[PDB]
Amino acid sequence: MRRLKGTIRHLDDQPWINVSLFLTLINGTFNSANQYPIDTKHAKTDQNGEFVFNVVPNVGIDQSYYILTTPDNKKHSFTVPDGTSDIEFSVVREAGIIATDPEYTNVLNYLEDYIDDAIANIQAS
Amino acid sequence: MRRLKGTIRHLDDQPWINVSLFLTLINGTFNSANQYPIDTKHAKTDQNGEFVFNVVPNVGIDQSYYILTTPDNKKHSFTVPDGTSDIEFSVVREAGIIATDPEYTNVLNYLEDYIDDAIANIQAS
Amino acid sequence: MRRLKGTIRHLDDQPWINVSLFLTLINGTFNSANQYPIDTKHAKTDQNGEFVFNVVPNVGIDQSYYILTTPDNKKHSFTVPDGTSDIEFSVVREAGIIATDPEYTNVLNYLEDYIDDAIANIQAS
Amino acid sequence: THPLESYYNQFLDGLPTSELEELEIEFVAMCIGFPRSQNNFVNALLDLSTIEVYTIRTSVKEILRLDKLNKESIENRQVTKVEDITMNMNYIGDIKDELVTEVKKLARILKLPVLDNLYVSYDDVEGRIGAN
Amino acid sequence: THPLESYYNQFLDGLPTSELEELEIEFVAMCIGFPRSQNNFVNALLDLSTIEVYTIRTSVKEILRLDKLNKESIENRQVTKVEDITMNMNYIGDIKDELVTEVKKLARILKLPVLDNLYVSYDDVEGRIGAN
Amino acid sequence: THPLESYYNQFLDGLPTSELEELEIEFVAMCIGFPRSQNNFVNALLDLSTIEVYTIRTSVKEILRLDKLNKESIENRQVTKVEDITMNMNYIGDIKDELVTEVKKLARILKLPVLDNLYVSYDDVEGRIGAN
Amino acid sequence: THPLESYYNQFLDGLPTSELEELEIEFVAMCIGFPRSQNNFVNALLDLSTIEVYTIRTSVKEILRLDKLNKESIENRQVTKVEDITMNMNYIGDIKDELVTEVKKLARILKLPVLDNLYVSYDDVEGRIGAN
Amino acid sequence: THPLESYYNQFLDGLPTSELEELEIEFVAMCIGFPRSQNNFVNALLDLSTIEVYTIRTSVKEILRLDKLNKESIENRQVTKVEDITMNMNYIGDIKDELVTEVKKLARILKLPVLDNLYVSYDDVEGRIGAN
């Protein structure tokens, strides 16, 4: 999974405090070992204006296409790339709905397991 | 027969505990020696978010078919491929979802040629 | 006189213990020695889900057609062939129908593979 | 799309009659006001006959249909007799009363007094356990 | 496709006069709120004559027809006098009255008290047995 | 297709005055609620003149026709004065009154008291033996 | 654009049957008038059922729809019977009635009484923790 | 160009739920009558939940809209049924009622007693910090 200690600041350079940020996953996503249904979570800015999140990358054919809603009425779309490391919200928002490619590993891995079982059966036959 | 297994967890990757999950056949099916009309079963996630369905390998005379109802009431369509062993639901959820965006003998041909390439690699023996 | 045997099981091979089903002779018939008007018989499921009916072959002079109604509410209309030997229901229900939908296809995504696996036997030499 | 809506829509030839689904049982509990775990409620759920459950499912489908019809009509009532088609201004009352009758029908099939629920209003024959 | 309707529609030339099937008996029991196991109910089920059974089946068929017609017509009442066609506003009341008339007719056929059931209300004579 | 309906359909030119067929006797008992065993009922059949029998059969045919028309007409009453034809909203009441008149004529031909029957309830004479 | 409005827009097929989103809990507590904690609210959210939550979400969806419809309607009511389309002068009253019925439904499904809230007007079943 | 209008028009896809700047508190104070310095008012300003703030802002926007619309409407009422359009002579009353409804809604959200202010009249609850 990936984290995001994105920070939000008041216009006068002071940090927002106890303001609600929202994230929503617009696509039912699923990896080999887990399912991620369309779900939405909310967080509150710390006293210093930071906000943390725990999000998953594109692990299915469809996009792990999140959108974040700011206290200032905005919406912003994006997809968190893969890896295990915290991300800064600035860069991801600068980008958005990066791309998606057919990943059939869940199909491919099962196919490999079944084929290997068949080959072992051939050997034992 | 097949103990279809599945693991569900929130965006925090915390498993959902004892949450309701539904499964339903869509048409009565019968083998040479038995008959399997429509039924719907229910499961609850364990402490680890796991759930098991003793589903039938549904390769029968009539149109065998299954729908899985997730906690978000999203419906996944899939029909169990034959076999006698536990199967991870992600595989069918990605393969049965080939009914979605049903690429006519393109994804299927993608997999066929992948199998051919695996066989070719195996030819070295 | 024949005995119609029929085994009914949930989608997890679990018998539909204590459920109801019906049979009828839609068009009343007769033989040279007996009269068989329209009648409807009801039955329940045993602990195994099996049900046995005492039925008359559809050798009627004018016409003779049975129809069975299941818990699914699907109607299976069939004719019992002549003879006294007990006959399995699945045999006479063999007159079923087929409709087209992509969802019937995923079984091939194994069987074709198995069929492809059969091709492996070719290289056995 | 209501869960029960799709659930039944998958069955076009009448309706299934085997047993009440935990989802259907939950819906019945909700629309009658009986908590699902109430011992008397579960006891009433036992020993049912096939036509009983068929009528229960018919009533549930009617409940859902009339509920949707209630939502859709509110955009009407804006006017009266557009050019000559004058509309019964009590259509809302009619559908509300029909819903109440359906809930009472459920209560009578289960042989149980109807407790306070969303649809009924001040006309109830139950309290906590019994005797209204 | 009500099970009783799917049973009846075969017998186009009249209706059979053999006896009441467990489905027909169950439906009747539901319509007069009599649980089948009641000794008085079954006792009444004996001594049944031919025309009695035939009229009972006819009344049951009428019950089903009117019940379906109710859900058909409830969509109406949305308007009045479309061009010249004024709408009988109590029509649903007429349907209810005829339905309860059929239920009472059945009760008279079986000579049994008509008690609180799913259709009629407040016409509950001498409860389950003598009660109220 | 009522059995007696066909039985009468055979008698195209008028109706016979021979006796009352067991079906006719059963239907009469149904109409006035007199189980055929009752000596007070069977004795009425004894010494029953011919023209009386013809009148009984005519009244029974009328009962059947009016009853069928009752079920037929229910699908009407949806509207009033479709274009220029206003309809008696009491029409159903009219046929109910006709049916009760017919059953009273039946009971009176046999000099017997009309008791609680399927068509009349609580407006009858003498009940079981001396009830009213 | 209401936040919950978008959140529900994300759900094309019905609405999810999962636990209430803390924002949803906030809104329903606003509708009833609890501070998301009264030692009664949380315990109402302790006891959960699948169909319950779907009903809650559809009811609050209707709350939003009706309130925005009310917001829009006020521009009308300037006139009556432009040419022949009259206007229901009670339309806004109808919307108020629907909103109060919806909040009453929320409370009833949550088994809780209604205190003085933004929508309900003097029609309360509660005060502070208990006032009946 | 009211200051709140010129502040809100910057937010389009809804309204922000961040907090209340002194302008919004000043406007709410005027609509409630509490000077912003009142402790019972400032403390109530605390503990606000996001949806509560959203509701306050929506109500304020509606207050502004209705206030402006009142100014336009008065240029009407010079006439009645100009050619075929009847005029709702109490439309101004409707606007006043909606304004007082919104003010009361604000009061309920803040839990404070609605009292002397520009809009509402005689619905003065507690006067100054204690039942009037």
Author numbering:
A (entry chain a), B (entry chain c), C (entry chain b): 1 to 125
D (entry chain L), E (entry chain K), F (entry chain J), G (entry chain M), H (entry chain N): 9 to 140
Task: Paste lines from the article.
A-1(L) is a Myoviridae cyanophage isolated in 1970s9 that specifically infects the model cyanobacterium Anabaena sp. The dodecameric gp2 portal, the pentadecameric gp5 and the hexameric gp7 sequentially constitute the neck of A-1(L), to which five neck fibers are attached.
After multiple rounds of attempt, the structures of gp5 and gp5-gp82N complex were finally solved by imposing C15 and C5 symmetry, respectively. At the 5-fold vertex of A-1(L) capsid, the 12-fold portal/gp2 dodecamer, the 15-fold neck/gp5 pentadecamer, and the 6-fold neck/gp7 hexamer are sequentially interlocked to form a symmetry-mismatched neck. Moreover, the trimeric N-terminal domain of gp82 (gp82N, residues Met1-Ser125) of each neck fiber attaches to the gp5, whereas the C-terminal domain of gp82 (gp82C, residues Ser126-Leu241) and beyond of the flexible neck fiber could not be modeled due to the poor EM density. In detail, the ring formed by Loopα4-α5 (residues Ile83-Tyr99) of 15 gp5 subunits is hooked by six long α1 helices (residues Met1-Leu25) at the N-terminus of gp7, whereas Loopα1-α2 (residues Leu20-Glu30) of three gp5 subunits tightly interact with the Loopβ5-β6 (residues Thr70-Lys75) of trimeric gp82N. Each neck fiber comprises a trimeric gp82 with the N-terminal domain clearly modeled, followed by the highly flexible components gp80 and gp81. Notably, the interface between the 12-fold gp2 and the 15-fold gp5 possesses a rather poor density map, indicating that the relative orientations between symmetry-mismatched gp2 and gp5 vary in A-1(L) particles. Moreover, we found that the purified gp82-gp81 and gp81-gp80 complexes could also form a bead-chain-like structure, which suggested that the neck fiber is independently self-assembled in prior of being hooked to the neck via gp82N.
